[PDB]
Amino acid sequence: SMKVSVIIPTYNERENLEELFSRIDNALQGLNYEIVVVDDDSPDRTWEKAQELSSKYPVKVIRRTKEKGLSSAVIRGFKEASGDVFVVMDADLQHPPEVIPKLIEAIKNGSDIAIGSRYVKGGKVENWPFYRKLISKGAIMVGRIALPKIRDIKDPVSGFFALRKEVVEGVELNPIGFKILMEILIKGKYSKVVEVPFTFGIRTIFEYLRHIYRLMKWEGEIDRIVKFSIVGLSGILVNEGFLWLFVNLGIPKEIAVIPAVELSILNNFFWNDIWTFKDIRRGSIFSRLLKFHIAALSGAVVNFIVYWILLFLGIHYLIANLVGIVLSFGVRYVINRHVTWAT
Ligand SMILES: Nc1nc2c(ncn2[C@@H]2O[C@H](COP(=O)(O)OP(=O)(O)O[C@H]3O[C@H](CO)[C@@H](O)[C@H](O)[C@@H]3O)[C@@H](O)[C@H]2O)c(=O)[nH]1
Ligand SMILES: [Mg+2]
C-alpha cells in the first residue's frame, strides 16, 4: 500500500471543488489518498468550502494569512503531506483527475516523477489558438535548450504532475519560483521521469526568464558561459598575436588571417576541453575538435545572416553588427554544449 497526497493550491476557486473532488474520488477510489488544499486567505468563500467537504472527502485544509504565491503554496503542501506519492494539480479542472491513475501507475512502474504533458504524443490543449500554442512551446524550447538537464522534457512547465516524496526531502526549492515543476526538475533527486499525455481543459515572460537565469546559475551553467568567454578572450590574443607576427614575416594580411584564425580555434578548443567542459567530455578528442570547428563556423553564418537581415530591416550597421556577434556567441555556445560536448 501507498498513500497519495493530491496537493491543490487555491485562490478564488469555489464552483470547482464539488466536481473536482467528485472526479478525484472516482478516479482514485480505493487508493489511500488525501487531498491537501493550501489557500492564501482568499476573499473567496474558500477556504470555507474545503473544510465542509472535509466531511465527505479526506481533505486537509491550509489557510495562509500572510503568504501568497502558486509555487510557494506547493512547497507548503509538500511539508503538510503524509503520503508517499505526491500529485500536484490545479483546482480549475484544466487538469483532469481521470488521468491521475495513469500518473501513479507510472510512478509505481519505477519512474520517480510523472508529468501530465500537453505536448507528448496523445497530448492536447484544446480551445487554445495556434499563436498562443506556439509561444508556449517556444518558451518551453528556450528552457529545454538553456537547461540541458530537461532537454528531452517536452512539458517542463506543467503544473500537473506526480512525484515520489523522496524527490523533495531535504531539498530547498525557491518559493519565488515561477513554475514549481522545473524547480523540481533542476534541484530534485530522481532518476526516471516520464510524461503522460493529457488534454488540457477549459476553466509574464520576463518573470519566466529570471527563473531560467536562476536555474542556469544554480546548475552552474552561467559559470560555464563565463569560463567560455574567458577562453574566447585568449583566442583574441592568440589570433591577433599570430596575425601581427605573420604579417611581419612577409605573409600578406589577407592570407595571414587564415592560419591565425585557425590557431585561435585550436587554442579555444583546447582550453574548453580541459576546463569549461572537462566533466562532460566524451568520444574522441579529435571528434570533439571536429565538432568545435562546426561550432565556430556556425556562429559565423549566424552572424552574417543576422547582420544583413537587420540591415534590410533598417537597423544601424553598428547595432546590427553588435547583435550579430552576440547571437553568434550564443549559438556557438549552445551548439558546443549540446553537440560538441554531448553528455
Ligand atoms: N495559494 C495560491 N494558489 C494559487 C495562486 N494562483 C493560482 N493558484 C491556483 O493555481 C491554479 C492555477 O492558477 P491559474 O491562474 O489557473 O494558472 P494558469 O495560467 O491557468 O495555468 C498555467 O500555469 C499552470 C501552473 O504552471 C499550469 O498548470 C498550466 O499548464 C498553465 O501553464 C488555480 O487552482 C489557482 O487557484 C496563488 O497565487 N496562491
Ligand atoms: Mg488555470
Q: Please list the residues that pair with 88 across neighbouring strands.
A: 7, 161
Q: Round to whole Å and give the CA distance between 83 and 165.
A: 8
Q: For ligand 1, atom 5, which residue shows the shortest CA distance?
A: 70
Cβ atoms of residues 225 and 144 within 8 Å:
no
Q: Where are the alpha helices (DSSP H) in 60-117?
A: 70-80, 100-108
Q: Under 8 Å CB-to-CB from 252, ≥6 apart: which residues?
A: none
* Position 342, amino acid: A
Instruction: Read off the DSSP letter of residue 23.
Output: H
Helix (H) / strand (E) containing 33: strand 32-39
Cβ atoms of residues 101 and 28 within 8 Å:
yes
Instruction: Please indicate whether residue 75, judged by its CB atom, sits closer than 6 Å to ligand 1.
Output: no
Instruction: Please indicate whether residue 40, judged by its CB atom, sits closer than 6 Å to ligand 1.
Output: yes
Atom of ligand 1 nearest to the CA of 40: 1
SS3 at position 179:
coil
> Within its chain, how far is the Cα of 186 from the centroid?
8
Å from CA of 131 to ligand 2 middle? 18
Q: Round to whole Å and give the CA distance between 272 and 277.
A: 6
Domain ranges of the chain: 3-219, 220-343
Cβ atoms of residues 268 and 228 within 8 Å:
no
Atom of ligand 1 nearest to the CA of 8: 34
SS3 at position 125:
strand
Q: 227 among the known binding-site residues? A: no
Cβ atoms of residues 106 and 114 within 8 Å:
yes
Measured N-to-C along each axis, helices 221-248 and 205-218 cross at an angle, to the nearest 10 degrees, of 80
**Parallel/antiparallel/unpaired status of strands 3-10 and 85-88:** parallel
Q: Round to whole Å and give the CA distance between 317 and 323.
A: 10
Secondary structure (H, E, C), 313-331:
CCCCHHHHHHHHHHHHHHH
- For 161, phi then psi, to 5°, come to -155, 175
CA atoms within 13 A on the CB side of 54: 14
Burial of 91 (0-12, 13-18, 19+ CB in 10 A): buried
Q: 101 among the known binding-site residues? A: no
Measured N-to-C along each axis, helices 285-312 and 317-335 cross at an angle, to the nearest 10 degrees, of 150
CA atoms within 13 A on the CB side of 265: 21
Atom of ligand 1 nearest to the CA of 200: 30
Instruction: Read off the DSSP letter of residue 224.
Output: H
Q: 179 among the known binding-site residues? A: yes
Q: Round to whole Å and give the CA distance between 180 and 76.
A: 12
The secondary structure of 255-303 as a DSSP string is HHHHHHHHHHHHHHHHHIIIIITGGG--S-HHHHHHHHHHHHHHHHHHH
Cβ atoms of residues 67 and 40 within 8 Å:
yes
Instruction: Read off the DSSP letter of residue 338.
Output: I
Q: 33 among the known binding-site residues? A: no
Taking alpha carbons only, the member of 126, 197, 130, 202 closest to residue 158 is 197
SS3 at position 37:
strand
- Resolution to one decimal, Å: 2.9
Å from CA of 276 to ligand 2 middle? 41
Q: Round to whole Å and give the CA distance between 199 and 211.
A: 26
Angle at 279 between CA 235 and CA 180, to 5 degrees: 105
**Parallel/antiparallel/unpaired status of strands 124-125 and 59-63:** unpaired
Burial of 301 (0-12, 13-18, 19+ CB in 10 A): exposed
Instruction: Please indicate whether residue 159, judged by its CB atom, sits closer than 6 Å to ligand 1.
Output: yes
Cβ atoms of residues 158 and 113 within 8 Å:
no
Q: Round to whole Å and give the CA distance between 117 and 31.
A: 23
> Within its chain, how far is the Cα of 23 from the centroid?
30
Q: Under 8 Å CB-to-CB from 324, ≥6 apart: which residues?
A: 302, 303, 304, 306, 307, 310
Provide the greatest CA pair distance for the chain: 92
C-alpha cell at 317: 550597421
Q: Round to whole Å and give the CA distance between 202 and 40.
A: 23
Angle at 180 between CA 178 and CA 184, to 5 degrees: 130
Instruction: Please indicate whether residue 91, judged by its CB atom, sits closer than 6 Å to ligand 1.
Output: yes
Cβ atoms of residues 75 and 175 within 8 Å:
yes
Cβ atoms of residues 27 and 59 within 8 Å:
no
